[PDB]
Ligand binder design. Sequence first.
Ligand SMILES: CCCCCCCCCCCCCCCC(=O)O
Ligand SMILES: CCCCCCCCCCCCCCCC(=O)O
Ligand SMILES: [Fe+2]
Ligand SMILES: [Fe+2]
Ligand SMILES: [Fe+2]
Ligand SMILES: [Fe+2]
Ligand SMILES: [Fe+2]
Ligand SMILES: [Fe+2]
Lengths: 285, 286
Amino acid sequence: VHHDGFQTVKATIDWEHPMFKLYEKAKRNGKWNPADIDFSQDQKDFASLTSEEKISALPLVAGFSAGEEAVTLDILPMAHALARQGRLEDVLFLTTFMHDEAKHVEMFSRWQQAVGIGQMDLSVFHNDHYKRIFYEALPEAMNRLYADDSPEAVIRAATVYNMIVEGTLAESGYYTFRQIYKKAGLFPGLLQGIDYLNMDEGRHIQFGIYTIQRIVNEDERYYELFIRYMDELWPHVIGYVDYLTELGKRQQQLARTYALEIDYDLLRHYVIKQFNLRKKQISRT
Amino acid sequence: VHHDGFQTVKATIDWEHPMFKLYEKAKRNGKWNPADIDFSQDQKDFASLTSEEKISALPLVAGFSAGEEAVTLDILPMAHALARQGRLEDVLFLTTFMHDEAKHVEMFSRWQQAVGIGQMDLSVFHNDHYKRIFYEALPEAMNRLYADDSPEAVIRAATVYNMIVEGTLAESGYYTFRQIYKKAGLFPGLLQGIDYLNMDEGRHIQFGIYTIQRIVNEDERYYELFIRYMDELWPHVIGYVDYLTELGKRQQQLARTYALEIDYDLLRHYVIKQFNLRKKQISRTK
Ligand SMILES: CCCCCCCCCCCCCCCC(=O)O
Ligand SMILES: CCCCCCCCCCCCCCCC(=O)O
Ligand SMILES: [Fe+2]
Ligand SMILES: [Fe+2]
Ligand SMILES: [Fe+2]
Ligand SMILES: [Fe+2]
Ligand SMILES: [Fe+2]
Ligand SMILES: [Fe+2]
């Protein structure tokens, strides 16, 4: 349907808008290119591992590659909905959000290509709980926005995408990866990629917080919706984390070999800690 | 609806895909930031202009600010449609396309702000023909893709967006701006912007050509749709140009004051040339 008029013809960009400022920061701090990352030592590290040590890295990488591809695709209806609402500064920011996610997908796939597992189907490390979140709940919540852009719908989308998938699972995923492979001196190229990714994602979570808070600010009732939507997803979050833990505990060769005492109970509590932290970043008031 | 699986879990990105290669080039050649452009001399240039010289420049800027804003908003359905078809490399590319357009919107708005016309409503320089293309036909063709992603729908969208709006009107707009202010030595910040923008837009048109040609390749009968869609929009293209031309003759001062022969018959023939050139870049067979 038709454009009424255009904001940058009638007026200008709202230069003081928080998402415009976040967009400016994204351009400044968004220059990294996954094509520049040197994965040659990652290839040597991976080839050096035993077959049993080889697999133990794959479940997390499977989770990330699928995760980045999903969020690359699944942000488009948010961008559509806020565009339809005339929120131009939000849309400007979301162009950097989307391109960031494209680089994230690119980075993990380049790592798989480089270490020699591009042809391997990593879907086998997605359990029912992972599928419930990434194959189903995430795309359902986002796609809803094409036909229903109510505050309830926008809060739920931002909750699943920004606060759970990015803010709880991905944040925990980064930590985990550094806790394991940074200590083992493994996969320097991947860890460099993860570092750049973690920086991008700090901006993404700020958009999610801004979006949820601005709606809660309209009506305190939406705060309770936010809490409820977080809690509804927790079982799948922890169900996936438990699955990953149980896998790590059955394939402990890498831990032994590299002196690592992967404290899975520490990782588990970090996930819980992230979940509760996200809740605290939204105020009822 | 659900994801069946994911290409970068089952396999990898198709590293040889034409749109993946275009994506890589975009990242390499797309580092410019409108926020770094010095518009202080543009401000002084604009202030030194006579009132009649001031309104010589504004209709074109009006066309571009609205144009960039429209295409920023209106690419989203194309990205959605291609994503839903599983064309991952196309989607990776389109993230650079979209962020480019965001920078283009930004650049023209920064210029308006800097020269002191941000508070002016430039809508007054969009005539019925401009409105038909940018307020109506473009969003109608793009939004159609949410419910109809047929070959016919995708060709029509790429034709309006990439071949007419970008490849005919915008290409002719860049040229025109340089043919007028580069010679005059005016608005160096804006011209610097236009140059970076023109580089970006080369990639956008390549996506349009690839998309239209990959569909035409499946069935030559789509070639005739392409031509028909181009021709349907021509009356609004030239009708906007005549309105701009009509304005530019009714305002002689910037030309004469700045030593210029703004040859409007030359620019009109640039628009005509761009249009036939776009037609030629698609073949019945390739
Ligand atoms: C063993 C401890 C469990 C740690 C939790 C691991 C979760 C796997 C990570 C997959 C989700 C990635 C989502 C990306 C979101 C974005 O890019 O904005
Ligand atoms: C008198 C000479 C007329 C020349 C034609 C002038 C047309 C004005 C340009 C406005 C269209 C801009 C469209 C944005 C394209 C994109 O950024 O992909
Ligand atoms: Fe990401
Ligand atoms: Fe993200
Ligand atoms: Fe379970
Ligand atoms: Fe543009
Ligand atoms: Fe463009
Ligand atoms: Fe007319």
